[PDB]
Design a protein around this ligand. Structure first.
Ligand SMILES: [Mn+2]
Ligand SMILES: [Mn+2]
Ligand SMILES: [Mn+2]
Ligand SMILES: [Mn+2]
Ligand SMILES: [Mn+2]
Ligand SMILES: [Mn+2]
Lengths: 468, 468, 468
């Protein structure tokens, strides 16, 4: 409670309260309040600001539900003490609820709590596995006359030839080969190790950290599962902390899905399962443990896969990863292997923890929308029948056409994905977790970027198309 | 009191007494006195210097009413201790009052206290919201042969492509998109956070701080309302502190209204309302809460809007912001939304705090003249009837002409504004708060600049006009 | 004739036909035709292209009246022979006349020939005196982050200190002091001398050339008077030739009115008078020779001075010259001296050549519109009475106000000028020489620039307004 927060305020001295607070149709935002100003009223009626990022015609002020005054903590990082204390959207206003043209954290719950009003179960766990890139210099720009971008970080093969002064020292990981190889070679740990400490400090639980697979600083930190609304918001920290230590160390950290080509572009796998009492109705018999229930879920996703990836796969870049691999998970099936397969029902053991890993989502989504939409579907499957059918176990590769061609795809390609969502509306819209707007506005946004991207001619195009 | 100041002097040791003291037809000034020299006499008869900035023919020495020996405090910043202790203009001389060709702080009060002698009420509150820019390097010059200016600060999009050495690190806010996004991206807080601490240290009350919306370091710090004379003079500190920490941090801070084009040029919104006993006669029923009274005010402004913006909208730059937007508040109406609308009657709640936000004024005015003139009018409306009519609620945009054309404008453009004031004299002149001179001198000044500006040919003109 | 042109074609071999042809609401344009393609049909039905520069909604092709197939000549400059052969606008189309949203050369004549249908006289002579600047390097640009421009040319004082290698050699003209001083000091002649040769080669008649008064390459070449339509179009060459030799020599030539500040920005004085048979009804008795007739003219201008300078004084820069001088001709009176006075009735001798010099117009106008509008007015004065009153002979300077203040001004300042024209319509509109459109479109254009100019903040503004 506040009574509490209240102490904490003195527990630590603190002044100011901020970093991470609102968070856009896109991601993260803050405002800073002098230490005083906090006080119940504050806790009970909020504070309010207005529009900007989704909003039309004048003055729609929005209450800032100083909230989840639980989701409150001392941010390491800022200078002088201060309780980073999220806010539950802007609630609305006098009605007091869905922030204008969103309230991502809201939608979260509508979803969440809505779930609860079905009975399909009682609690939904989400355990996302977001990877990120840690490089040294990131320069880029674009303009009438040209366009470009360059990435560098001691590591990333490329750099060997590179001259230094303390000079080369040459231990580094070559293209898809950043594979937990011990140090000299490992840009470093201390950055990860460190990120954990703070991650936990901030309040998440770390499960292991390590180097992913990419020539130039692909790093992954894992974090114990939660409840959509919580976990989603944990991603929000998970991120803030990375960005920051990373930067505090000397690097830039980036959750882009495909910074470079011919390497590995981080992706956010999401593991999930709902439970009733202390029973995860995702379990049972029938295929890899699991159960009827689950299957409708496996159903749900697969059904609106496209609309979802419009939600959990934005900015164009998203899809430069979601390029047909074999490695790359673009198939809409489930397996326990035979990847390529976008739904993995990991082995299990204790039914106690039987789940679903839908990997395709990329570190770029508001865990809020994404999770929501994941769930939202999952259960409309769980809901009206809907049935997986069989798992893959027969990797992609089949007389390419040979209906392997026929085979359902992960909606590779924004515009496309954007579309789906325009049509799928429904299963989202259901419960209230998702207004037409919300949906609209959302689309409407991603739309612009999609444009800026295609109107701007690409370096490669010259490569191939120039001298014609 | 002095008796007091007197202690404080020993309370702290201190030597010297200065920083911020007089303040021009334009803004801020000081002189330093060895610690001794202070002593009653001093408190009672002042100290005096002379002319320079407004003054004609020899020797008009002016008493320096060592005053508001309340408005006294230890300046952090200067080296060795010293009580920055304003001065109430130069009083005059033997008459002892309106400093030659001004006494901005005086005018303030004439106004203020004059207000009091009407009965329209007892106390006028002003709560300005001044925004400012925080950049790294500011180079410019002009001369027969050429002219120019360049601005830079890690942030401001432009800089991505830019090479560094610790190198890029690329998190920064792109054009109208400095929107409280959390750190990596936020040049930084510590500068704001910090500014608050000192702001309060200096004696103001902070209400929240944050990043405004502009590619390259638009920062805003908010401060609790006051009494014209006090608040006005608080702006005087609000400024000194910004300028200084900002500089002490490594940046230049600038209250110019439109440093760059296609971004956001800070503006000083001013919220106001007068009260009688502990009753703000600005309240009631009839439109958005409010009351008859208020309306005449809404009247007053609107009436002499032009003359006012001549006062609260100088240096040419002022108007490069006051360019017809839709966003930009150049309409002379009131709304509670439908911005574009230069008078916003914010929602309210407790009639306890019902007000008027007239946004158009820019961080560039002597809060003194500005506030004064704001008020001065406000009540001549409040005074002889004068009536708003209806609010907007129908944003600008109407068959441009379609009398939307007809519609009253915020006097966009200095010369113009200058003019108004030449004619409006009156409502200012009334009470004594404003001599012909004052007015004259004032005009007369802004005049020159306006000239230097138009005689000097502009980079763009070459753009477009050169090859003809 | 064509029959002719026809020879000329063989007289010289030539292939191609082009340089200078159409010419915008602004100034000059061409298209190149293979030598063949010319042939009567061509001469009789033209060639046609379409829109771009003034044009709305699709496809309005415009005939190109291969015309004034008189106004035809071998362009020195282009590579391979070619008959630069103007075109009489695009005529229209099937109607065949006023080019879409103009036909500047057309308007010219409507005017001209319209004149003829009044009887006020038979022929109007125009003898403009356009000055231009000849510099070495011209760099400038503007953009979110900054703006600027730099000018240089051995000459322009500034350069003395400048180091060279063949090194300094120091003879050059210091600020308002480029005054026919003999060579070492005179950037050079050969550029002028040369320009003459070609000017005549192109077909104009040179009367004398020399250095005007400005530190850095102000050059003037004079050319014998003509008929609006002819002379106007002569300016069109006068220009092309300058631009070109100038460039061919090693310099950039610029007809901007005020490239630099505190120097002299070229201006196009225009001398005029109409005649009946071989009698210039501008003569007589009554003031400085002259005659009733003239006076109504002197009237006409003075009457719509503002609207005219909107026509013969564009791009903003225009007015940085038309800044109140005493030297500077912004007064609306006539004198034979007492300059400051925008209308000079030069001494005379032979009534044979008695005229009117209205100096204010600047090298920047389509001689077409300008001349037209000059005339167009001139005679609406000549027309319905309208009367000068007395000449100045009492330079500006009179208790500034002392109604010297009262005194009619040269409409200094675009927006303003723009306006006038919006209202003055009439006297233009009269005859058909000027459609509402034409007028509209015109305005509408200058409008944009005027904007780009004021929205973009100015180097100086930082000078003065920054540290506030
Ligand atoms: Mn991984
Ligand atoms: Mn995984
Ligand atoms: Mn603001
Ligand atoms: Mn405001
Ligand atoms: Mn001359
Ligand atoms: Mn002349």
């Amino acid at each position: 409670s506040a009574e509490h927060v209240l102490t904490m305020l003195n527990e630590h001295e603190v002044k100011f309260v901020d970093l991470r607070f609102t968070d856009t149709k896109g991601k993260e935002q803050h405002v800073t309040i002098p230490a005083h100003q906090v006080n119940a009223e504050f806790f009970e009626e909020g504070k309010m600001f207005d529009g900007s990022s989704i909003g039309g015609w004048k003055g729609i002020n929005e209450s800032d539900m100083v909230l989840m005054p639980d989701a409150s903590t001392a941010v390491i990082d800022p200078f002088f003490a201060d309780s980073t204390l999220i806010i539950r959207c802007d609630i609305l206003e006098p009605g007091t609820l869905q922030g204008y043209d969103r309230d991502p954290r809201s939608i979260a719950k509508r979803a969440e709590d809505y779930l609860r009003a079905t009975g399909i179960a009682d609690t939904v766990l989400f355990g996302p596995e977001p990877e990120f890139f840690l490089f040294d210099d990131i320069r880029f720009g674009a303009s009438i006359s040209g366009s470009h971008v360059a990435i560098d970080d001691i590591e990333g093969a490329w750099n060997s030839s590179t001259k230094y002064e303390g000079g080369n020292k040459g231990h580094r990981p070559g293209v898809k080969g950043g594979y937990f190889p011990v140090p000299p070679v490992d840009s470093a740990q201390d950055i990860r190790s460190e990120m954990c400490l703070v991650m936990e400090q901030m309040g998440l639980v770390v499960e292991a950290h390590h180097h992913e697979v990419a020539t130039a600083g692909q790093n992954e930190v894992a974090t114990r599962f939660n409840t959509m609304t919580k976990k989603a918001d944990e991603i929000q920290i998970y991120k803030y902390v990375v960005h920051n230590v990373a930067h505090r160390f000397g690097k830039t950290a980036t959750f882009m899905p495909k910074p470079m080509f011919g390497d590995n572009g981080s992706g956010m796998h999401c593991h999930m399962s709902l439970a009733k009492n202390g029973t995860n109705l995702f379990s049972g018999d029938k295929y890899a443990g699991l159960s009827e229930q689950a299957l409708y879920y496996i159903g749900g996703v697969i059904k609106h896969a496209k609309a979802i990836n419009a939600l959990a796969n934005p900015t164009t870049n998203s899809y430069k990863r979601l390029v047909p691999g074999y490695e790359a998970p673009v198939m809409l099936a489930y397996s326990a292997r035979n990847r390529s397969a976008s739904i993995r029902i990991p082995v299990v053991a204790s039914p106690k923890a039987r789940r679903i890993e839908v990997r395709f989502p990329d570190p770029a989504a508001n865990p809020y929308l994404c999770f929501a939409a994941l769930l939202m579907a999952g259960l409309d499957g769980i809901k009206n029948k809907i049935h997986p059918g069989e798992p893959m176990d027969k990797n992609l590769y089949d007389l390419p056409p040979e209906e392997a061609k026929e085979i359902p795809q992960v909606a590779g390609s924004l515009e496309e994905a954007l579309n789906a969502l325009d049509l799928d509306r429904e299963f989202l819209k259901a419960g209230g977790v998702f207004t037409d707007e919300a949906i609209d506005a959302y689309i409407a946004l991603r739309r612009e970027e999609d444009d800026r991207v295609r109107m701007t001619p690409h370096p490669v195009e010259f490569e191939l198309y120039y001298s014609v």
